[PDB]
Amino acid sequence: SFSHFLYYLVLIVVIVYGLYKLFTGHGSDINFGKFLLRTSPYMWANLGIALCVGLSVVGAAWGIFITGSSMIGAGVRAPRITTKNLISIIFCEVVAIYGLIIAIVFSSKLTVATAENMYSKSNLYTGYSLFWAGITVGASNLICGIAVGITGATAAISDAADSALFVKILVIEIFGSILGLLGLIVGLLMAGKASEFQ
């Protein structure tokens, strides 16, 4: 496999470079601390916001097409199930709503900072908090959207056979949506103390 060979070559190159820097006495030259301190926190904040909304939308679309394919497939014989299983698509799109809300909240903290206070403690904390909270919300919404889409596909296929299946698989779908809700809660909690760039 070309991808596996590329991964192995990258690992070997990284190990060789690290050993070369360490053995020669320049091991501290591979400094992640200086990389994080000298990196603009605007980069972290904007990447966090963009990845939050992007991964939330990716998860929403993932669940949407998984559920919609099954809804249309099972609707050929039972068209009555589309309107009743639209709740599954609603539960898939609510994660995109969550990502949009988190993106709005984080973008409210995108203020221009002065040159002297560019990499201050508060600014660096804001950048890290926005980046990681956006990553958390986006990945949680992606995972929740995929799970809710799988559950909704099963619910549509099962309630095509008998309508009593939907009222019992909606519980599992609500359990799935709880994951996205908790992801939003944690993402807000991380950025609660992160003040605007100053």
């Binding site: 097409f65 394919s69 497939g73 609707g75 014989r77 099963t154 296929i157 095509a160 056979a161």
Partner: protein, 345 residues
């Protein structure tokens, strides 16, 4: 995981196939069809089912058990071809491999008719229209297996399945066509099992591996029992006829190859518990069909699995068989064994 990547290409296929499964007749509908009086009443009862008005064009006097079977089979094959024509890639290859099993039976039936010199129209009618390679009607004349292969089988996707049949005599008879069918279908089973293992993903991979193992065991038992009555069977040559992908392989298949008596066959099958009771008592084919229906029902429990297509196709083929049996019993009015149908839904 299972359903993360399935619905990209096979979500619609799975939904429609499981709706078709929902359309399978239940026990209550089977009983209602059993309580019919005439074939017209059977058609009217089937109208209320998910068959719809498939016999609407058929007149009352034209309504016959053979024609009912023809229309039910035509509807089933139209559904299967529609499902295949909406799928691509691994699913399309899976459907083609499903069709190859009927195609082998079609070529065997055509050759049997060719030596038997039966009526061409009835020979074409009896053939399964799912497995149809373009040179299939050519089979009504071709007899030599070398000429067979070079002029027909290389063209068909059955070419990889014809490897070791050149050893036998060039003249072809009923025994030759039977052994050629067995060898071809064994090679097809090996190729299909390999395709399922490599390309078909979990959980459809394991489910269809189990289903193909059951099919291989079934045909191994059938081949052993059909060759037991014949005295020209070689124990080592029979290994080329018994499939090697089933649960019987390798010990039970070896014992079956060395088996020469019905008690010997039972001792060979003593390795597996499921198949012991099948020969212990009762109708063997009835037990095979019942366990096949049970396996199809178990296959339909798994979601985001393409094995549900195979489970559906076997289930509705059995459903068409049951409809034909009920129609024949009603037309002949011999309802002593009218309730001898196999259903799990």
């Amino acid at each position: 995981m299972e359903g993360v990547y399935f619905n990209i290409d096979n979500g619609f296929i799975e939904g429609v196939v499981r709706g078709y499964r929902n359309g399978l007749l239940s026990n209550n509908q089977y009983i209602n069809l059993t309580q019919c009086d005439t074939l017209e009443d059977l058609k009217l009862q089937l109208s209320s089912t998910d068959y719809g008005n498939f016999l609407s064009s058929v007149s009352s006097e034209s309504l016959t058990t053979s024609l009912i079977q023809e229309y039910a089979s035509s509807k089933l094959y139209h559904e299967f071809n529609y499902i295949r024509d909406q799928s691509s890639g691994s699913t399309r290859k899976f459907m083609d491999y499903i069709t190859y099993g009927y195609m082998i039976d079609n070529v065997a039936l055509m050759i049997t008719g060719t030596i038997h010199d039966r009526d061409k129209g009835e020979i074409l009618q009896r053939c399964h229209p799912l497995g149809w390679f373009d040179t299939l009607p050519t089979l009504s004349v071709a007899t030599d297996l070398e000429s067979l292969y070079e002029t027909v089988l290389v063209d068909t996707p059955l070419a990889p399945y014809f490897k070791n049949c050149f050893d036998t005599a060039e003249e072809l008879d009923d025994m030759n066509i039977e052994i050629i069918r067995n060898k071809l279908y064994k090679a097809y089973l090996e190729d299909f099992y390999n395709f399922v293992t490599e390309e078909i993903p979990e959980p459809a991979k394991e489910c269809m591996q189990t289903l193909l193992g059951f099919e291989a065991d079934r045909r191994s038992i059938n081949i052993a029992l059909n060759s037991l009555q014949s005295s020209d069977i070689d124990p080592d040559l029979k290994s080329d006829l018994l499939p090697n992908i089933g649960k019987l392989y390798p010990l039970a298949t070896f014992h079956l190859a060395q088996a020469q008596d019905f008690e010997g066959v039972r001792a060979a099958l003593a390795n597996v518990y499921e198949y012991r009771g099948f020969l212990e008592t009762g109708n063997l084919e009835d037990h095979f069909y019942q366990l096949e229906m049970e396996l199809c029902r178990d296959a339909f429990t798994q979601q985001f699995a393409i094995s549900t297509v195979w489970a559906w196709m076997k289930s509705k083929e059995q459903e068409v068989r049951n409809i034909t049996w009920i129609a024949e019993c009603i037309a002949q009015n011999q309802r002593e064994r009218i309730n001898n149908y196999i259903s799990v839904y």
